[PDB]
């Protein structure tokens, strides 16, 4: 069986970055040249692996994490980065092994008047650990008065919609991102090349 990368890359809808999706790939064969040859990917940056060598090894696990962010935020999906997305939404480890793949999705994910379906976390007390996911919607206390789950001054809903509009500049346009993590442990190695 072919690895179901089409289900990931060609999915009709993507996850919000704060609620980023993870798909485990296993028990299948992949041709990674189908991905890295593509003129569609404006980002294709690998760490610890060369994409032209991914076909050379059977892995024990491949994970595909996917979500939508702004074009100006794709740079945050890299080891060692900081900012709202790296700190509070999706965090790669300092010594990540895998590839970060992104493409402009303005034609799919922007809407007249703003797409409110894609959200990010604006407020969080502390930074995420690598590969941590926070989907909570507790009202965020920015002042000394407790919020008791009620929004108001100094008491904020922690998530925010991107509101993608098709006429935005490219830095404000939505980008679909897929992060491929590659692992080889002392376990069955079932994710193979051609």
């Amino acid at each position: 069986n072919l690895c179901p990368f089409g289900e990931v890359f060609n999915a009709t809808r993507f996850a919000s970055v704060y609620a980023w999706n993870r798909k485990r790939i296993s028990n299948c064969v992949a041709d990674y040249s189908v991905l890295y040859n593509s003129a569609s990917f404006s980002t294709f940056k690998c760490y610890g692996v060369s994409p032209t060598k991914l076909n050379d090894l059977c892995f024990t696990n491949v994970y595909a994490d996917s979500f939508v962010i702004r074009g100006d935020e794709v740079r945050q999906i890299a080891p060692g980065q900081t900012g709202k997305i790296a700190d509070y939404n999706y965090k790669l480890p300092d010594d990540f092994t895998g590839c970060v793949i992104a493409w402009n999705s303005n034609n799919l994910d922007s809407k007249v008047g703003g797409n409110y379906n894609y959200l990010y976390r604006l407020f969080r007390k502390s930074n995420l650990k690598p590969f941590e996911r926070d989907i909570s919607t507790e009202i965020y206390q920015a002042g000394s008065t407790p919020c008791n789950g009620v929004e108001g001054f100094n008491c904020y809903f922690p998530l925010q919609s991107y509101g993608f509009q098709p006429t935005n500049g490219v830095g404000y346009q939505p980008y679909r991102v897929v992060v491929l993590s590659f692992e080889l442990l002392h376990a069955p190695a079932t994710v193979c090349g051609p």
Epitope: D72, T82, G83, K84, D87, Y88, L122, F123, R124, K125, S126, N127, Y140, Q141, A142, G143, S144, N154, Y156, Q160, G163, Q165, N168, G169, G171, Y172
Partner: single-chain antibody, 225 residues
Framework: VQLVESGGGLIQPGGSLRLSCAAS????????MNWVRQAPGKGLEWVSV???????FYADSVKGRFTISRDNSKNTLYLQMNSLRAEDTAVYFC????????????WGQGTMVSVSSEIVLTQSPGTLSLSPGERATLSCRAS???????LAWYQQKPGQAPRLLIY???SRATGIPDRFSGSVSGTDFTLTISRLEPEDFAVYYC?????????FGQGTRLEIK
Amino acid sequence: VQLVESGGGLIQPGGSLRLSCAASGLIVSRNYMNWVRQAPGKGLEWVSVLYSGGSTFYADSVKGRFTISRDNSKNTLYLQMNSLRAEDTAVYFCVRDLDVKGAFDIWGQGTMVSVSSEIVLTQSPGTLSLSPGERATLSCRASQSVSSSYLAWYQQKPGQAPRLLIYGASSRATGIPDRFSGSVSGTDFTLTISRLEPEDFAVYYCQQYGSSPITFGQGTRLEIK
């Protein structure tokens, strides 16, 4: 809620200063806290930010010279300023940022420091002279596209900190009268005052916070004809 700055002075070039900003009502460690500066007779310049989670960012012109920090137990923000230059002369403001949820809404009173790429926002006219009761239109044009969610207008009276008028291009801040309105048409971002009151004569600044660094227009002086 209040922010109280201190630590400024008149210092020789090459010296150091440490600014302090004591907060009440808001918690420094829970907020995007910023330093913004204003040189004598000039506009506003973003200097530094400290995230609740600890990340820090700086304007290129102060990198390697200034350091932002906080003391949670003292609910205080600091700006350590080393290797001071004549160009660092400004009033320095401590400011809380709500970003798309409310922009720079809380400002301190400022502390004076005297020593002796980015989206450009162009405001027009430089000076706007009109009579009370008239409609005023003020323009702000960006050097590249800025989504409407990331635009704000401020009013500054003499000797005071700027006051947020409008954020997200068209959302009035709390307590701002409805004669103030904001709109975007093309690359032009406009502030309209439908009927000028005597208290409306002030300096007006636009701001974008969608691309780093945060930048401000050079200001429009609204004066009586």
